Amino acid sequence: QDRRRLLGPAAAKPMAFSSEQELSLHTGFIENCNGSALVEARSLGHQTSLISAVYGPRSIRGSFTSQGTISIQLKNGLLEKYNTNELKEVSSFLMGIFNSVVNLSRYPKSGIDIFVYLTYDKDLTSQISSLIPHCITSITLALADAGIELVDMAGAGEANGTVVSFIKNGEEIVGFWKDDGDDEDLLECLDRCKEQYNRYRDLMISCLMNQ
Amino acid sequence: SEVITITKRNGAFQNSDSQIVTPGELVTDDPIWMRGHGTYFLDNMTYSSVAGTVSRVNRLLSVIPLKGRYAPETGDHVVGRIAEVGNKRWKVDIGGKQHAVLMLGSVNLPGGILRRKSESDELQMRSFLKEGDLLNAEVQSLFQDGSASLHTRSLKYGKLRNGMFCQVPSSLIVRAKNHTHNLPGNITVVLGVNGYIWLRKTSQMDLARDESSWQIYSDENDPSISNNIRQAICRYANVIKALAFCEIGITQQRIVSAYEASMVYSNVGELIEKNVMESIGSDILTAEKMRGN
Amino acid sequence: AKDIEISASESKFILEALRQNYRLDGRSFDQFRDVEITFGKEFGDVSVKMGNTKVHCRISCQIAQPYEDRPFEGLFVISTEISPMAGSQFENGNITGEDEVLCSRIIEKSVRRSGALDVEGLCIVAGSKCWAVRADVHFLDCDGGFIDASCIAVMAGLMHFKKPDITVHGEQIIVHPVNEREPVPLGILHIPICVTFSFFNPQDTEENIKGETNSEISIIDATLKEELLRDGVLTVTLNKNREVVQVSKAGGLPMDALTLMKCCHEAYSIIEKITDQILQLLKEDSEKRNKYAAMLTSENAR
Amino acid sequence: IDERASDLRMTIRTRGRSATIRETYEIICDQTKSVPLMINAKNIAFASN
Amino acid sequence: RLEIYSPEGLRLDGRRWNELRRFESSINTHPHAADGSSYMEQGNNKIITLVKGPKEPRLKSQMDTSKALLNVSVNITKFSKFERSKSSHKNERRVLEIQTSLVRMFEKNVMLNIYPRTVIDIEIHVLEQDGGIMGSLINGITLALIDAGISMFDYISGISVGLYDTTPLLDTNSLEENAMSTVTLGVVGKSEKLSLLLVEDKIPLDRLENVLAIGIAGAHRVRDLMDEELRKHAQKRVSN
Amino acid sequence: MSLSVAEKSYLYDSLASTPSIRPDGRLPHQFRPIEIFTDFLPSSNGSSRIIASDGSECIVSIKSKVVDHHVENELLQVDVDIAGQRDDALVVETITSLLNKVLKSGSGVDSSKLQLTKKYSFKIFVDVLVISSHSHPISLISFAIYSALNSTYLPKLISAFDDLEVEELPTFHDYDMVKLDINPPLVFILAVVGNNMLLDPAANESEVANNGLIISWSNGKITSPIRSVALNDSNVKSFKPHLLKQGLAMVEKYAPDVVRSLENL
Amino acid sequence: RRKRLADGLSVTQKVFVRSRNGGATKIVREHYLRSDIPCLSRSCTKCPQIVVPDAQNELPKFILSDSPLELSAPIGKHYVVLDTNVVLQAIDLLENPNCFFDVIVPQIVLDEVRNKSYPVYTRLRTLCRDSDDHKRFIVFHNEFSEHTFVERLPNETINDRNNRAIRKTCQWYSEHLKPYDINVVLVTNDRLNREAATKEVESNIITKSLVQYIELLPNADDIRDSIPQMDSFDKDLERDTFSDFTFPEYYSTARVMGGLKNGVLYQGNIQISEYNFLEGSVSLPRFSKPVLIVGQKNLNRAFNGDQVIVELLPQSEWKAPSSIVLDSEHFDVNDNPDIEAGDDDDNNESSSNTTVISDKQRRLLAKDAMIAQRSKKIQPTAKVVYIQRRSWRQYVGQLAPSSVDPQSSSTQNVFVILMDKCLPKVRIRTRRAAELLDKRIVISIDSWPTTHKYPLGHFVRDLGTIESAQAETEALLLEHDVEYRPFSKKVLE
């Protein structure tokens, strides 16, 4: 047990155990939040749904800050299990992309609270590499819905556990991740992921066009 | 190697007398001396309080620190930066035991000489000087707190711009009232008493000795800094890290002799390597012995 | 948390009262307040009152897993968590917690580290099942006297306490009710009782430290104002066998070994007195619990 | 559980001091079959406010 | 199991009954980012200290007109034992207890009076312990503060005595710690006035003088190394 | 920030031009003076103290246990702990992740120099204490782990254990140690300020840089993890494919020399 | 490595690997070296200056003399140095003052023998203390002499170094003794020393057989005898195995069930004998006769009065009745408890009691065995193959004195000696050991492992002192399940 939460019997232990994808977007479907997005991706491999919610611009007064900042919580899925550290890494990754895409100068004393809910990931057949397009798709939508400034829509592909995020129509790269891909994938992946980004670009623009 | 320097060691964590460097040990029982700084007493028997030498500063034979935090005094001219901006004063970091104070009756301002500001607001203070900005300011009165009331009041005083930061211990530079001067290649060093060093291209205020009045605390980096200007500043700051390394005084002539000696090496990144920093300090000492001072 | 603001005149006055050899309570420097021990209607409920200083201790046991390093001992955990019923300088569990730690740590150093409660015999099954005994010390009123009172509250609490009679077969423990069979009292190896000497300077630190004079005002059993105002402390803990169980000295006025040991010697008389008082009070409450138990004796003569 | 579960060893604890070799029970769960929850239907409620 | 002593005056380290352990120290181990620093070896207790500050804090509540605020952080890493520390220790009572003891004690030894609106942070990183560690940590602090130019009255010197009935054994290791009652003591200056006496175990009151008296001698012996070390260093940096 | 507005523009100009001169004044292929000190714990398997030129200090320590590896899928555990930060601030745990992934088994590091028979692996407990930080630690930690893991001595097996030798726990020779050879990656950090790609940023450079790229060298080639990072919040920009391809090319050339100088002290 | 600290003081570090359950922990022991080691002897001229202050306020007195024991040439006047095997094999001769007059115990020797058997240790320390003018034991140290110190090299074992340290102690001390003409004889009983002498290595030592020294002396010649440790002895007394460890594993559950079905396993209550731990007898009621359970590994982790499943052995292996008596007073009383923690103490579940029993005990097992082969009444004989059912209870007992040091306040592993004589000596570990020695104790049993030959208990509670009549009356009440408390709150209703 603990003083902040009920944790039941503590000598108790867990149970031991025995474009190729479609992204369909949704926004503005739940309220107590400045904007929300929903991304569900279906593929042969795995089907996944990611919820995001973005809270604020919030004022953080009692101190003057040079410019605003972005704070990313990833929350462990209810059907996916990951180490806390990996979630931190990915939070750190996404922050550094968003730092580059969100313009921050129209908002003094700002903190923005971004929540990434990695709710459902299910296989019909690392892992954390694959859901990075979907996280980036979700969060961008949310910043757009709320009315937070952005340089270009952010969006990425995943080619062979390698994730490359671009802005400006494939022209500039705002981040690169390679983890357990093969040596010298560079050309295949960049070509393949450009296709992916241009393809999900317009999908996000068309979600934003129903409102 | 060619590309890296590694000082190589293995097998271990790392690599007489002097005048009273332990308090709890009997300096003097005389009741007329040892009344000042770095002592305490029961009776007149004074048992030290700090580590250092005994030596007569002022009128009193007194324990004098071996090394410690920068200590302000009246008449000093120091280079230092804003830590906090308030509704009535800036808190200035000089590298001391607490922060020094710089306030509105004590500040020249761009847009006139004192203009562009009609009321106190924390905003109006903040527009000129941001946290972390660097500026050369003179000691107006030293108070017994530690705190030092500073002032900027000339048109040479105020912001340091067009340069690169450098820094040392404050006891391995000469203590003088001023030490800010022109050096060859037409860069100017601005060198306080506190160890902070700015090295910039010779601008109007330092060029007028051989000004500005809208550029006193206004941000401006000239586009007219060129290749050879920048390299001069990298070489200059480096040779200063050689004399720093070698734990001797820094006088303006040592910098010019050092600068010239370093040119047997043709690339500027070769001058931060240890073997060379020892050669440069060895050259200067060798020059001091041959010359006679 | 918010602290009590006393005057300069108060600070001067209380020192001068010690200097001219009185106390506020009308006590002597060596006089300890009478502790009264009120045993509950349950085992291990003890109300411990010393004058206005009111503290309670309730003991609980539970079945618990030993620890990895020594699985041949059980567990003593002391909660000396404090809530505002004495001030507002103690609030919300831990919020500063300096005092929490020190009182908790000394009581552990007394009962578990040295022994004053058997721990070997707390293993029901070694490396599997043990008793965990939890002392939860809760102050309701305080007028200084903090460590002294807390300790007495821990040991009287433990002595009056009793635990389910258990039968093991295998690793299955049949836990037996306290009306079903009579619960078993804990093992006690010693009786630590603390005496906290609060030291007040008539000089200032600098004259003290390379002087050698003793003229330091030694008082025990400080008041609330005294607790705040003390320049230094010695907490020394003895058992009624001429051994010092634990000493905590770490900050405040320095003292010669002779003077420290003086302190110890004074405390040694005062702890037999408290120990005695505790013994005869326990007995008379026990007589009332024993009143038909005496009739139904199975230890009888042939 | 395995045959002679009551005599399976634990050798997980180390650096004691006795009781660093003992029996223990060890029980995996297998979800290749799962029997469904036995529940009291009458005691199902649904809330309001 | 094992001998702790013999009438022949040996141990299983091989020390004598008033012999000290290996005392090695050197100062200025971080002279590029820490105001004073020192490395302390006593035995295999390998302690590094850094003093960072005097510096003003940038929080107003930590500012104090009457004296500096002093912070002593005792950090104990996961490789100080022989095995990997499974537990969190930087959030444990045992360590907060050492913290509360070193701070209150050095708070009076150090003059904080001459550093108003300051915060000092003493940062004490243990690299290994092999027992006799509670007296060793005091000693490392003492060399750090004197190096940093932070004024003081005296050297506090920590020393441990383990009593093997009537036989007091000056300095200790893991065996001595775990096989009898140990006393830990500190003296400030060449005074007989004790700053710190800490006892975790039954020490008899009748023998209380025997263990302290040999320890106050034993302490003087530690303090002269500290001076010798320091003046050998100060002479070096005043020749140049 | 902690620098000046004026200082940051001078730097941006300095660095961003063709020569790319900087307070050290290095060409982009050069590295500051580092000092390797090793083997200072007789109690540990191996240990490492590395002092860098900005006055950053990491101390890296190697402890072990031998364990059955068929109940494990991890062999190397990094615990990172940065003085003056707690055990769960965002940067600390992100460093722990990076480092654990660099050192992940069968991925740029051996999982067969750590096994003494094909049932028993040694679980190496990497435990990292950063004594002072004010610049990024990961490169220095990478370099410290190299020297460490080539100073890692393990217990030498008493006798050649099989996996059917007698089916009891492996048991070590009393004194005799085996030298551990094993080639860990080396993490190298590249910095982009304009269209200029520079090896090894100093503190100063990190504060003006648009982005950097963390890449690693294992086994005579470049390999995963690859990660971009943004080394400020407030001087950040985007970058081009061609500059990312030039940073590949640069490491491939300038990495080998460094590994060979670092290997033998 | 060896590195100067101070005047005639230098330190060195010894780092070695200890394994507790795959633990792989390097242990660093700092070993201080000093030239200040006394020789303890009145033949030594400079030894007055060598001795140093101590806790007792005195310079250590001499106990070895200027006249030691004297034999013909080239032996002369001679100090006897004892090898590691010799201390175990020759213990009673040592306890006799009749053939061991002037004895040097190497400190390395004292370390090895204390770890195997802590009784042998304590007895020998007491012989040292109560030395006189005719049985004079000293320890000479040399782990801490800086002129008798040995390194540990790669590509060897600890036994090689241990023997080298003694060879080097003899030549050192025999050289220093030459102006006074006192020879050192190493009396050895280990094969590595005896054949090192034979192949020729050095010739600056007199090296003797255990038996050869004995057979010259006519006071012990054939009166007291000894064997090699296992250098040229191999057990045939009643043991056949070299190790006392390792009690069998039980028959698996269905393998029991199938044997009960097919009627090849029989079961009954093992009624152990009160005079023997090795002789247990089961009541199997398809016979009239007691069915004997004989020998350590046939008992199969028994406790008294258990439901035991037994399988019979052939008539070939069937014994006749045994006439001997064993108890916890005369047997296992120079065996010690397993050590499972410590930094220089054992960390293994073997090699603590490979053999450390006395000569008397060996001869009694042997004599049982000689009688047994002409004993008659050959009757059914078996091994317990399963414990169907347990009979644990709380058992009374008292704490063994020679498996503990009284001075020492340490967490000592020590035996409970039970007052029921149908179970052996029970291991416990307690930091109350001095306290508990005078008191009758209650342990219960936790388990018995399959790797040790003595149960694991834990201490429950204390009764009074052993002098106390009340305490004996109470222990006997506990044992026989007789409740003594007043009748409860509910009884009165």
mmCIF file with all atom_site columns, C-alpha atoms in Angstrom, chain F residues 41-46 63-67 122 152-156 168-177, chain G residues 1 13-28 151-158 348-349:
data_model
loop_
_atom_site.group_PDB
_atom_site.id
_atom_site.type_symbol
_atom_site.label_atom_id
_atom_site.label_alt_id
_atom_site.label_comp_id
_atom_site.label_asym_id
_atom_site.label_entity_id
_atom_site.label_seq_id
_atom_site.pdbx_PDB_ins_code
_atom_site.Cartn_x
_atom_site.Cartn_y
_atom_site.Cartn_z
_atom_site.occupancy
_atom_site.B_iso_or_equiv
_atom_site.pdbx_formal_charge
_atom_site.auth_seq_id
_atom_site.auth_comp_id
_atom_site.auth_asym_id
_atom_site.auth_atom_id
_atom_site.pdbx_PDB_model_num
ATOM 1  C CA . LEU F 1 41  ? 38.296 0.664   -6.811  1.00 0.00 ? 41  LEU F CA 1
ATOM 2  C CA . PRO F 1 42  ? 39.957 -2.716  -5.848  1.00 0.00 ? 42  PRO F CA 1
ATOM 3  C CA . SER F 1 43  ? 36.478 -3.705  -4.837  1.00 0.00 ? 43  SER F CA 1
ATOM 4  C CA . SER F 1 44  ? 34.956 -3.234  -8.345  1.00 0.00 ? 44  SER F CA 1
ATOM 5  C CA . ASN F 1 45  ? 35.505 -5.189  -11.632 1.00 0.00 ? 45  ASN F CA 1
ATOM 6  C CA . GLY F 1 46  ? 36.526 -2.064  -13.303 1.00 0.00 ? 46  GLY F CA 1
ATOM 7  C CA . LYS F 1 63  ? 30.110 -4.377  -10.763 1.00 0.00 ? 63  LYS F CA 1
ATOM 8  C CA . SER F 1 64  ? 28.661 -7.862  -11.696 1.00 0.00 ? 64  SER F CA 1
ATOM 9  C CA . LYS F 1 65  ? 26.889 -10.942 -10.745 1.00 0.00 ? 65  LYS F CA 1
ATOM 10 C CA . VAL F 1 66  ? 26.831 -14.291 -12.831 1.00 0.00 ? 66  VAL F CA 1
ATOM 11 C CA . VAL F 1 67  ? 23.262 -15.259 -13.626 1.00 0.00 ? 67  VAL F CA 1
ATOM 12 C CA . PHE F 1 122 ? 27.377 -12.349 -16.309 1.00 0.00 ? 122 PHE F CA 1
ATOM 13 C CA . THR F 1 152 ? 36.767 -4.843  -16.726 1.00 0.00 ? 152 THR F CA 1
ATOM 14 C CA . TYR F 1 153 ? 38.306 -7.890  -15.162 1.00 0.00 ? 153 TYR F CA 1
ATOM 15 C CA . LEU F 1 154 ? 35.874 -10.683 -14.344 1.00 0.00 ? 154 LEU F CA 1
ATOM 16 C CA . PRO F 1 155 ? 36.361 -13.782 -12.278 1.00 0.00 ? 155 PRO F CA 1
ATOM 17 C CA . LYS F 1 156 ? 38.028 -16.625 -14.233 1.00 0.00 ? 156 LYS F CA 1
ATOM 18 C CA . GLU F 1 168 ? 24.863 -26.817 -10.361 1.00 0.00 ? 168 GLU F CA 1
ATOM 19 C CA . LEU F 1 169 ? 25.918 -23.195 -10.161 1.00 0.00 ? 169 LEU F CA 1
ATOM 20 C CA . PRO F 1 170 ? 29.264 -22.141 -11.772 1.00 0.00 ? 170 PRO F CA 1
ATOM 21 C CA . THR F 1 171 ? 31.985 -21.454 -9.218  1.00 0.00 ? 171 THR F CA 1
ATOM 22 C CA . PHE F 1 172 ? 35.053 -19.156 -9.782  1.00 0.00 ? 172 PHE F CA 1
ATOM 23 C CA . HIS F 1 173 ? 38.786 -19.512 -9.339  1.00 0.00 ? 173 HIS F CA 1
ATOM 24 C CA . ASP F 1 174 ? 39.844 -17.915 -6.089  1.00 0.00 ? 174 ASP F CA 1
ATOM 25 C CA . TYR F 1 175 ? 42.395 -15.240 -7.241  1.00 0.00 ? 175 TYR F CA 1
ATOM 26 C CA . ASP F 1 176 ? 42.851 -15.577 -11.109 1.00 0.00 ? 176 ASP F CA 1
ATOM 27 C CA . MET F 1 177 ? 40.824 -13.012 -13.025 1.00 0.00 ? 177 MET F CA 1
ATOM 28 C CA . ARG G 2 1   ? 51.554 -3.253  -4.225  1.00 0.00 ? 1   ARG G CA 1
ATOM 29 C CA . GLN G 2 13  ? 45.969 -5.330  -0.506  1.00 0.00 ? 13  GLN G CA 1
ATOM 30 C CA . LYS G 2 14  ? 44.850 -8.914  -1.062  1.00 0.00 ? 14  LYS G CA 1
ATOM 31 C CA . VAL G 2 15  ? 41.821 -9.119  -3.486  1.00 0.00 ? 15  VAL G CA 1
ATOM 32 C CA . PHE G 2 16  ? 40.051 -12.451 -3.919  1.00 0.00 ? 16  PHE G CA 1
ATOM 33 C CA . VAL G 2 17  ? 36.755 -13.728 -5.252  1.00 0.00 ? 17  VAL G CA 1
ATOM 34 C CA . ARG G 2 18  ? 34.107 -15.289 -3.017  1.00 0.00 ? 18  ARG G CA 1
ATOM 35 C CA . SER G 2 19  ? 30.989 -16.968 -4.382  1.00 0.00 ? 19  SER G CA 1
ATOM 36 C CA . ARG G 2 20  ? 27.821 -17.208 -2.517  1.00 0.00 ? 20  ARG G CA 1
ATOM 37 C CA . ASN G 2 21  ? 25.095 -18.416 -5.001  1.00 0.00 ? 21  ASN G CA 1
ATOM 38 C CA . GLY G 2 22  ? 26.838 -17.187 -8.180  1.00 0.00 ? 22  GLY G CA 1
ATOM 39 C CA . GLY G 2 23  ? 27.714 -14.037 -6.418  1.00 0.00 ? 23  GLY G CA 1
ATOM 40 C CA . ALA G 2 24  ? 31.035 -13.216 -7.965  1.00 0.00 ? 24  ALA G CA 1
ATOM 41 C CA . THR G 2 25  ? 32.053 -10.603 -5.280  1.00 0.00 ? 25  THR G CA 1
ATOM 42 C CA . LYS G 2 26  ? 35.609 -9.415  -5.093  1.00 0.00 ? 26  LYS G CA 1
ATOM 43 C CA . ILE G 2 27  ? 36.520 -8.923  -1.413  1.00 0.00 ? 27  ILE G CA 1
ATOM 44 C CA . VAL G 2 28  ? 39.377 -6.537  -0.606  1.00 0.00 ? 28  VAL G CA 1
ATOM 45 C CA . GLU G 2 151 ? 52.490 -13.303 -2.528  1.00 0.00 ? 151 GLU G CA 1
ATOM 46 C CA . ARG G 2 152 ? 49.751 -15.103 -4.379  1.00 0.00 ? 152 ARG G CA 1
ATOM 47 C CA . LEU G 2 153 ? 50.741 -15.642 -8.006  1.00 0.00 ? 153 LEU G CA 1
ATOM 48 C CA . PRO G 2 154 ? 48.657 -16.581 -11.051 1.00 0.00 ? 154 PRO G CA 1
ATOM 49 C CA . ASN G 2 155 ? 48.318 -20.259 -12.135 1.00 0.00 ? 155 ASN G CA 1
ATOM 50 C CA . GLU G 2 156 ? 48.189 -22.072 -8.740  1.00 0.00 ? 156 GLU G CA 1
ATOM 51 C CA . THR G 2 157 ? 45.833 -22.828 -5.805  1.00 0.00 ? 157 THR G CA 1
ATOM 52 C CA . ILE G 2 158 ? 45.562 -21.555 -2.301  1.00 0.00 ? 158 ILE G CA 1
ATOM 53 C CA . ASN G 2 348 ? 29.843 -23.043 0.583   1.00 0.00 ? 348 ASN G CA 1
ATOM 54 C CA . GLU G 2 349 ? 27.670 -25.948 1.583   1.00 0.00 ? 349 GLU G CA 1
#
